[PDB]
Design a protein around this ligand. Structure first.
Ligand SMILES: CCCCCCCCCO[C@@H]1O[C@H](CO)[C@@H](O)[C@H](O)[C@H]1O
Ligand SMILES: CCCCCCCCCO[C@@H]1O[C@H](CO)[C@@H](O)[C@H](O)[C@H]1O
Ligand SMILES: CCCCCCCCCO[C@@H]1O[C@H](CO)[C@@H](O)[C@H](O)[C@H]1O
Ligand SMILES: O=C(O)CCCC[C@@H]1SC[C@@H]2NC(=O)N[C@@H]21
Length: 189
C-alpha cells in the first residue's frame, strides 16, 4: 500500500512514460514499398514501459497514450489518430501494444530479472513480447484488413526486425540504467 510520496512518484513516472511515447511519435515514419506500414520509433517507448513501471503502471501508461489516440488526439507517428485509424492496416500492432507492458512486466517480475545482472534474459523477454508478439499480431491483422496473403504479410514484416532489435537493445540499456538507482523497485515487488 503506497505512501503519498510513492503515489506522487508513480503519477510523475507514469505521466512521463506516456509523454515519452508521444514525443517518439514526432519523428515521421519511413514508408517501405510492399506493405502500407511504416518503420517508426514509437514502439520503443511501448517496450520500455513495462520494464520501468511493471505490469500494472506500465500498462496504464500505454493505455493512456492509446486512449488519447482513440479519442482523436494526433499522438501516433506523423500526427495521426482517431478511433477509425485503429481499424486500418497498422491496427494489429497498436492493439498488441496494449498488452506488451503487461507481458514484459509480468515476466521480468516472475523471473526476478530486475533483481539480477541478467540483462540478456531481459533482452530476450523484451524481444519476445515487444518485437515478436507485436509484429506477429500486426502481420495477421494486416493480412485480414488489407486482404493480402498471410505469408506475404509475415515475410514483409521481416523488414521491421533490424530496427525493432535495435529498439529492444536500447530499451534494455536505457531501462537497466534508469533502474540501477533507485527507485523502480516498488513496481517489481
Ligand atoms: C508533449 C505532448 C503532450 C504530452 C501529453 C502527456 C499526457 C500525460 C498523461 O499521462 C497520464 O496522466 C494521468 C493523469 O493525468 C495518469 O493517471 C496516468 O498514469 C498517465 O499515464
Ligand atoms: C488501461 C488498462 C490498464 C490495465 C491495468 C493492468 C492491471 C495490472 C494487473 O496486475 C498484475 O496482475 C497479474 C496477475 O493478475 C500479476 O501477476 C502481476 O504481478 C500484477 O502486476
Ligand atoms: C496543435 C497540434 C497538436 C494538437 C492540436 C489538436 C489537434 C486535434 C485534431 O487534430 C487532428 O487529429 C487527427 C487524428 O484524430 C488527424 O488526422 C488530423 O491530421 C489532425 O488535424
Ligand atoms: O502509428 C501507427 O499507426 C502504428 C504503426 C505500427 C508500425 C509497426 S510497430 C512494429 C513494426 N516496427 C516498425 O518500425 N514499424 C512496425
Amino acid at each position: 500500500a503506497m505512501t503519498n510520496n510513492q503515489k506522487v512518484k508513480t503519477l510523475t513516472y507514469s505521466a512521463f512514460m506516456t509523454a515519452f511515447i508521444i514525443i517518439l511519435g514526432f519523428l515521421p515514419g519511413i514508408p517501405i514499398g510492399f506493405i502500407p506500414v511504416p518503420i517508426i520509433l514509437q514502439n520503443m517507448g511501448i517496450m520500455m514501459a513495462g520494464g520501468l513501471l511493471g505490469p500494472k503502471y506500465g500498462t496504464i501508461s500505454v493505455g493512456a497514450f492509446l486512449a488519447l489516440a482513440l479519442i482523436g488526439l494526433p499522438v501516433l507517428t506523423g500526427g495521426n489518430g482517431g478511433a477509425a485509424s485503429f481499424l486500418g492496416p497498422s491496427g494489429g500492432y497498436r492493439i498488441a501494444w496494449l498488452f506488451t507492458p503487461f507481458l514484459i512486466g509480468f515476466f521480468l517480475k516472475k523471473l526476478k530479472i530486475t533483481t539480477s545482472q541478467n540483462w540478456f534474459g531481459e533482452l530476450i523477454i523484451v524481444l519476445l513480447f515487444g518485437v515478436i508478439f507485436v509484429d506477429f499480431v500486426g502481420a495477421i491483422w494486416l493480412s485480414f484488413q488489407s486482404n493480402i496473403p498471410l505469408l506475404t504479410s509475415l515475410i514483409s514484416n521481416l523488414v521491421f526486425i533490424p530496427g525493432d532489435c535495435i529498439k529492444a537493445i536500447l530499451t534494455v540499456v536505457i531501462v537497466r540504467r534508469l533502474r540501477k538507482q533507485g527507485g523502480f523497485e516498488l513496481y517489481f515487488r
